Design a protein around this ligand. Structure first.
Ligand code: NA
Ligand code: NA
Lengths: 102, 102
C-alpha cells in the first residue's frame, strides 16, 4: 500500500478499511496483530493468543497504529498460518461499474 | 438492501458506503440523487443538472437522507441513463478471503 492512504474505519469490529489511490483494503484486525506479534516474538502460538480478536471494537488511535505498522512488516500479506491478512478491491472496479473513469 | 443497515461514510467524495448483513454497497452520490430527482420530476436533464456531483463532500445528515430515500425508490438499481447506481461486494468474499466463515 502506498504511503499516502486514508483509513475509513472498522467494519463488523473485524476489518479495518483503508485505501490508497489504487485499492481499498479490508484488513483483518486479528491476522494483522498476529503478524505484528509474530515478527516480534517469532512464536506463532504466543502471537495468536495475545492478539486482538474479531468482535473487539478498536479506537481510532489503535487503528492508526496497526495500519502504520502493517506497512512496515516483513510479510504484510499473510499471517504465520498462511491466511491472507486482507481482501482488496481495485478502485477501478467500483468506478467502472457506475460508468466513471479511474 | 435490508432495512437494518450501517452507513460507513463517504469515499473519495463520490461514493457512500453502506452495508447490510449481505453486501457492502458503494453508492454513487450523483447517480442516486439523479434517480431521486428523476422519479420526482420525470425529467432526465433537469434531474441531472440539479443533483450533487462527484467531488462534493456531503454531511452525515445529507448522507442519511439519501440512503433512506434510496431504499424507497421505484428503481434503486440504475439511473435514468441506465448506469448502475452502485457497486456491491458480497460480504462473504471479504470474510472468506481471510479464512473466516460468513
Ligand atoms: Na509458544
Ligand atoms: Na428538461
Amino acid at each position: 500500500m502506498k504511503p499516502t492512504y486514508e483509513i475509513l474505519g472498522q467494519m463488523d469490529e473485524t476489518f479495518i478499511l483503508v485505501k490508497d489511490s489504487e485499492y481499498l483494503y479490508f484488513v483483518d484486525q486479528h491476522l494483522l496483530e498476529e503478524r505484528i506479534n509474530y515478527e516480534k516474538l517469532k512464536d506463532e502460538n504466543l502471537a495468536c493468543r495475545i492478539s486482538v480478536k474479531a468482535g473487539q471494537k478498536l479506537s481510532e488511535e489503535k487503528i492508526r497504529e496497526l495500519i502504520k505498522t502493517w506497512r512496515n512488516l516483513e510479510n504484510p500479506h499473510v499471517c504465520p498460518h498462511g491466511t491472507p491478512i486482507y481482501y482488496k478491491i481495485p478502485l477501478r472496479e467500483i468506478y467502472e461499474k457506475v460508468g466513471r473513469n479511474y
